[PDB]
Recover the amino acids of this structure.
């Protein structure tokens, strides 16, 4: 009588409504354990047997409820598709830091495991999610977050832990538009795969086989506010064609080669603390902390250091030989500011390629260098415009050195100093000159006049050479004339006597 | 017998306590669905009918429990006041990104909706809160988080979603002391309203009608660590009298005019990526990315770019013409560092007003400029002190140019170089001079001596003019004397012959 | 019949499974209230009596479930050890901002209190955790998170509130490897104690008796992304031997002395807004905002200001007299960039000790200073190498001033300017010289030649003194020769006549 289907509804409660609706109100979503056999449910709650409990999940999904509650039991699923906008609610008590053996997990919280040699555990659809779930696939195959359809899928994981997966991403060649707010990526082959438009708050990347966090082309956009990278058995941060990326705060600890790899993707590192790197590397050309190539990289507060293992360990020597490894065609950009990038052993750069634009300011380990704009800096010494070198015979056509400047406004004037350096290629003698140049603009155009010229033994002078009245001490004649109407670009003309023919390699630098 | 009020307590359990207390322990707070009719509760759980279920909420509040549990059903409330320190616990499965139609919401999680043409849905009090709730008011009226009493109210929303509201704030003229840690502000008329002492962790501002995140006077203080602003149909970030504000990391995407507006509020942007802006604007004077006025603005890592819509779209041309639009009285402050603010089309500034203090360093698109301190920079060229221009007739009273310096200590000396520029206003001729000045202090006071003077044709000289022994080549007499006892401020006196009277516009610049 | 142990299982439900398993599936963990007497449980749910309910917790722990559910009732425990990997799940409705009296807590959420004069409430083990729990110990004794064994313990608290504790840490001398993601530390004696490898997301430190957040030696590592420090009755931030530490974003408000204290620990402050400090201090030498000693401190976006209490208050005058207080042996490092550190009243530094390395750039209130590298800055004026002072009699052994430079490559040349300053110690006269030096390297070695020398009255000259052909105006002979083979280091030799003997204090500065 009371043991039948309608038995529960026949017993009232103190509130005024019977037991059945009292139980119905307490649940937030449909419980998976409801669709389970007694022995199978007991095994799930006891963490003992595999039991391949995929039918419970299939029936829970077929119920049609957008909310699925997975209690702390241990599950084993096989190729069960998750319908759209379906979320899995789970509670965890302990998320293991390092899962070295199958017995790493204890009771802890909810665990969903792949069964036997299944090719997948879940086939995700758009707008799916999960909380408190520790996904685990025993084999390093079966990539996690694998969509049923080979297209971009937007999901989200608030607190979850992915273990022993090939990659947290679909089909090895497609992207997922997700943001792992607080997750733990451990013992995988790829810590994060091809996330697009992702905002990852506090993830943790532990020792992963292979690369770790790897992004490919198109996986444009991505922010990693406070992620931490542990001893990844591989490349750690790896970006190839990601248009954007920014790792904000947390450190990048020991990695087994190229703690950061940047190939064609613009990136920015705000406060990344790039610790030791390249534990397993070939020393020269492969022990650098950052492998920079053909891309734009910006750094604002990056710190670095060298060292060995924390304690014990097979390798104790300071691992990273260099800091930068540059290769490929030289067309990238590099901006550096306020970064204490002195962490290396033998050198700073391991290639003959350099970014087309360099902006390094206030960073120990690298003197200030700027290659663009009117005001540039070379080796810590500033100058204006360009430093042109003109080598050739300074007879019958005075050598021309094209200088640049900020410019002069109308009815305005400017003054500046030029360092002129002469290196006679034949004899080997050296000479120097300091001159002061004033640029003035009237209503029509601008003109340049040499205020003063000074040198050792009065070798250079504004007076014309090849003249009987010329001072015999003077060997070089220097003059200046403006090319552009804005006086921004002019040129210095240097000539010698008609009789002598020699190459001197004139160099003119405009000092502010 | 068992169907009465005391029926539940008469059936024991395996643990040792009967069913009634077993049910009482499982619940964390009082369930709202308990105070509902069968048909009304079924409609709530089925997302079908309006049913105007305000009495359930009123009775739940009148119960006196500080915790209110709202299951995933759909509700419709009307002007129900929430007592103090009362929190609404809800679970959501999917929070819509863009709610374009009434059928945007599906099953998803808990939804609380305004009913018919009610002027409000909730009247909040101090220390209220909510989790997992997607508040929705069909009409764009009825501002959310509207306090019953017209005063400041401190609330908090961990994970909630506000849709189609006039503003998330009370009475259109009062403030709320809240911090939206992880929220979604979509299709409102104002994304965030007058939050005071707020620390917003990871909010999301989607396409909102009107301004979006707008703060007014008094709403002093506010931090937006990782918020993201989508295509707001209006002003996007808008601050008027907020004393403080700092947007830390996330980007500011396309907005329909003045992606940032700053009127009288000091602000700071740490790593904001200000994307395209001013989709709907009047081009000149209204297409700038930031409308800066009469305030203090600081930037540390700001990035910018131009572009059109992602795909399709009515407008495809690069939207923002400029980067800065400055108007109003010029008394503000502007500090810029390490910001790649090259994102514009035609210009950089759209006004004749400039901040009183400018500190721009290492930012592409703007040469270094500093207006305060001893060491200043103009157009990338540094100098010390001030660059004074003195125009007038240099006869019978030598023209005086007041120069500044860091100072000289007791029994100490300093040397520096001065560039002197002369522009004869009548004839139009131009002349220049370089001189070296040494400042020395003895026990009593300091004095200045001119080490050297050099010019073209020896026009200037330290020798006295109007003397028969004077070199005829010399036309100008230059001298230096100290005014302050600290030698920090001195002046350069330039004089001409007694016979000639002309204005030259002398300019003296102290080059380090 | 139905009231016995097996009564619940005899009533079926609509789903197909009886009431007993229906109740068993709804619970996530073992409920503590299950192991309680009727009157004791009623008192717990009514927040009325102490009742010393430790046996319920002991039996719940002895059950063996890794998950413990604490409902919103008020508890009183005494020295109950928490087994490993055990988490306490609680729900809170209101976390008090300031607990001034015992009646500060109302109904609110789950509260666990220490009973009578117990020496502890919980004895934690490895991998323990808690959520939503407001721990409170009435006496300021009984440190929270006190491990049973005196060793490092790794725990974690997502959302918890610690009130009136001696310190959140074990045994006053040991460390805990935890990360308080979102916590509230109020009215304690120490806000945070000896956290190791901690990543604290959004903590809140309210008015705490004593220091507040204090770290000691070994508590190396720690990140405080968005913590906020309120009016701590003590030292606020206090680090002694912590190897690392970085406070990222949130402000540091009024503190009762040394808002930051750094003794031997390297630290970095990214965007800390250090407000007023030292409300209770001895003015001179104790009213500084930061007490810096013998350590490395870096700052990137730090802001500061002065002021009094918000309203009312006993003290209304601007509190912090200075900004820095430096003491102890001078061997530390200091890096400053883009920090508006103008917040003080009387001065900036309160000690005669300075860091060995200083790098201050683009920070108002302090002129640019750099002490390392080839390019240095003093008081906003740049130079290359070192500024040596050589005092002594310049007769029979010319005085030598060792200058440094970046260096010259093979078959390369460089030019630069040297400022030479002479202060005759006997008479008191002062003199200055400007000279231009060219360094050139041939195949073998490098050599230096003086391009030009200029001074007032031609006092200095490259010609040899003590020669009958020497110009009588020349008093000093200057020469330059290179010491290193790289021409990076050379020296300037200055000599006088043989007859005169006097000390001049020569100073040579290499201006870029």
């Amino acid at each position: 009588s009371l043991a039948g289907p309608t038995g529960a509804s026949q017993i009232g409660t103190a509130n005024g409504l019977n037991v059945q609706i009292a139980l119905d109100n307490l649940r937030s979503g449909v419980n998976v354990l409801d669709f389970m056999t007694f022995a199978e449910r007991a095994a799930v709650l006891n963490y003992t047997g595999t039991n391949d409990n995929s039918e419970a999940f299939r029936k829970a999904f077929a119920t049609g409820s957008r909310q699925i509650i997975v209690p702390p039991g241990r599950y084993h699923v096989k190729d069960v598709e998750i319908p759209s906008k379906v979320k899995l609610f789970g509670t965890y008590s302990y998320k293991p830091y390092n899962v070295t053996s199958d017995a790493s997990f204890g009771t802890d919280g909810t665990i969903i495991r792949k069964v036997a040699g299944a090719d997948n555990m879940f086939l995700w659809n758009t707008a799916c999610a999960a909380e408190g779930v520790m996904f685990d696939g025993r084999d390093r195959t079966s990539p996690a977050i694998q969509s049923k359809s080979g297209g971009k899928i937007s999901v989200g994981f608030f607190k979850c832990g992915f273990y022993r997966f090939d990659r947290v991403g679909n089909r090895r060649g497609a992207y997922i538009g997700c943001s792992f707010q607080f997750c733990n990526f451990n013992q995988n082959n790829i810590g994060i795969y091809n996330t697009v438009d992702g905002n990852h708050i506090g993830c943790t990347i532990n020792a992963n086989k292979s690369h770790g966090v790897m992004l490919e082309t198109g996986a444009n956009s991505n922010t990693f506010t406070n992620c931490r990278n542990e001893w990844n058995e591989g490349d750690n941060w790896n970006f190839y064609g990601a248009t954007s990326i920014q790792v904000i705060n947390e450190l990048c600890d020991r990695a087994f080669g190229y703690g950061f790899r940047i190939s064609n993707s613009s990136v920015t590192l705000i406060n990344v603390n790039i610790r030791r790197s390249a534990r397993t590397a070939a020393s020269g050309a492969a022990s650098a902390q950052i492998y920079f190539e053909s891309s734009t990289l910006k750094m604002i507060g990056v710190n670095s250091s060298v060292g060995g293992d924390d304690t014990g360990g097979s390798i104790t020597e300071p691992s990273p030989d260099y800091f930068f490894r540059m290769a490929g065609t030289s067309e990238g950009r590099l901006e550096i500011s306020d970064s204490r990038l002195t962490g290396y052993t033998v050198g700073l750069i391991s290639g003959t390629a350099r970014p087309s634009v360099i902006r390094v300011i206030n960073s120990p380990g690298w003197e200030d260098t700027i290659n663009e704009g009117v005001a540039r800096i070379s080796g810590g010494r500033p100058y204006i415009g360009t430093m042109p070198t003109a080598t050739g015979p300074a007879n019958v056509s005075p050598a021309v050195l094209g200088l640049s400047c900020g410019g002069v406004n109308t009815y305005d004037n400017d003054m500046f100093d030029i360092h002129l350096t002469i290196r006679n290629t034949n004899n080997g003698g050296h000479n120097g000159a300091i001159l002061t140049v004033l640029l003035y603009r009237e209503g029509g155009a601008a003109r340049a006049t040499i205020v003063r010229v000074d040198s050792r033994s009065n070798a250079v002078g504004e007076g014309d050479v090849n003249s009987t009245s010329a001072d015999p001490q003077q060997v070089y004649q220097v003059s200046v004339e403006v090319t552009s109407n804005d006086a921004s670009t002019f040129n210095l003309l240097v000539s010698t006597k008609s009789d002598n023919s020699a190459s001197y390699r004139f160099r003119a630098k405009v000092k502010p």
Summary: The longest strand of chain B covers residues 430-441. Chain B touches chain C through 62 residues (CB under 8 Å). Residues 38-46 of chain B form the longest helix (9 residues). Chain B has three helices and 41 strands.
